[PDB]
């Protein structure tokens, strides 16, 4: 799919994304915090439709993500993220999607997620996370 | 004067500010780089006029500031920044203003300036610098 | 087991650890780089013996770890690291151990591992990684 790179910010206020219980993760749009102000990054959309959107609006700054995990798996030959789970210091959001295949997890002992980059086609192909104090 | 805090960014593209050869530094407006895009921060203006504006547009990203220096001094009882000089890896910009009083200097051996905060009234009262790799 | 925390350093020169093809990972001892000099951290040993030791001596500083992965699994009711693989920008070291159970992976796009902390009893119970530019 088309690659994207939101770059780095000062935190995260909200994360909206698509998921399909049969296929995999779809589009993603993150609203970061930029020096105290909301900063909605560009919407990274799926090439297709038929998803369910989930909107995680974090209670910034008292609430932050302490772990991101999910499942990687092939869908029609494509290796994509099929499930996602966002755990914060207040609650867990997810899992959303198909929890089958290879699991992955990024627990954070100290530090903060401050950005996302990746690639999305029909589904979320892969993604990376910016970390910082 | 009124305090301001631009916060942190990914670099600096341009710095515009006022100076008066008799008094001190006036308003300041910085254009940062935010993940590859220009991001003009808010204009922090002087309460008064009668200044000369200087516009330093850096050749980002090949060009970056390697040292900031100047003079601190009293103007009508107020301790303010009276002179500023921005040295980059390509050239020196300044000094602009009154070079009398207590000198200060922030040479940077490794790292980058990624933000400015401070206070401006009739003149620039004081300021701080965000540093980061 | 007994917890350990090497803290942070300026890089990694060598990593020695035990593994058993039937059970799981055993002891671990890291030799870091501290401002250009070798710094052998304390040996975090298993409570038992019967392992095979592997010594990964990285070609510092031109060679560094770009990903750490492995498998988590229960061994006699204990959830422990059963397999480890260290991939550098020069080659892959591993996997060493039992590759069964839940996989985990820490690919690093940018940054460096500069420390290890965790807990070891009969086997490596769990561990964390210090990251830094």
């Amino acid at each position: 799919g088309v690659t994207f790179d939101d770059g780095a910010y000062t935190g995260i206020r909200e994360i909206n994304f698509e998921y399909n219980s049969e296929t995999a993760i779809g589009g993603l749009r993150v609203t970061y915090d930029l020096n105290g102000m909301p900063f909605v990054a560009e919407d990274h959309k799926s090439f297709i439709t038929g998803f369910k959107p989930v909107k995680i609006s974090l209670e910034f700054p008292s609430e932050y993500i302490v772990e991101v995990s999910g499942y990687v798996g092939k869908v029609e030959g494509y290796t994509v993220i099929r499930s996602l789970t966002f755990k914060t210091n207040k609650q867990t959001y997810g899992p959303y999607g198909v929890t089958n295949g290879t699991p992955f997890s990024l627990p954070i002992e100290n530090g903060l997620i401050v950005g996302f980059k990746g690639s999305i086609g029909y589904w979320l192909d892969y993604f990376s996370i910016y970390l910082s104090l | 004067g009124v305090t301001f805090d631009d916060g942190a960014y990914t670099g600096i593209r341009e710095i515009n500010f006022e100076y008066n050869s008799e008094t001190a530094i006036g308003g300041l407006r910085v254009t940062y780089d935010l993940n590859g895009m220009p991001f003009v921060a808010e204009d922090h203006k002087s309460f008064i006029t009668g200044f000369k504006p200087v516009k330093i547009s850096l050749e980002f990203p090949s060009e970056y500031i390697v040292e900031v220096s100047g003079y601190v001094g009293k103007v009508e009882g107020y301790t303010v920044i009276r002179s500023l000089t921005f040295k980059t890896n390509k050239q020196t910009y300044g000094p602009y203003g009154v070079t009398n009083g207590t000198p200060f200097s922030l040479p940077i051996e490794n790292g980058l300036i990624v933000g400015f905060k401070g206070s401006i009234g009739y003149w620039l009262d004081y300021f701080s610098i965000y540093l980061s790799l | 087991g007994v917890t350990f925390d090497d803290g942070a350093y300026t890089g990694i020169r060598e990593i020695n650890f035990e593994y058993n093809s039937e059970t799981a990972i055993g002891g671990l001892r890291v030799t870091y780089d501290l401002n250009g000099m070798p710094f052998v951290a304390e040996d975090h040993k298993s409570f038992i013996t019967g392992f095979k030791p592997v010594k990964i001596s990285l070609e510092f500083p031109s060679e560094y770890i770009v990903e750490v992965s492995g498998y988590v699994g229960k061994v006699e009711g204990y959830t422990v690291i059963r397999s480890l693989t260290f991939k550098t920008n020069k080659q892959t070291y591993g996997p060493y151990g039992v590759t069964n159970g839940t996989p985990f992976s820490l690919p690093i796009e940018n940054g460096l591992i500069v420390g290890f902390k965790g807990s070891i009893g009969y086997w490596l119970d769990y561990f964390s990684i210090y990251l830094s530019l």
């Binding site: 780095a8 290796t79 993220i81 990746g118 892969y126 993604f127 | - | 690919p107 940018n110 940054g111 530019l133």
Partner: peptide, 16 residues
């Protein structure tokens, strides 16, 4: 190398 672009710690990607 050695430019004015702030560097960041990036982990991943996952999904390859």
């Amino acid at each position: 190398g050695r430019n004015g672009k702030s560097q960041s710690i990036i982990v991943g990607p996952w999904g390859d």
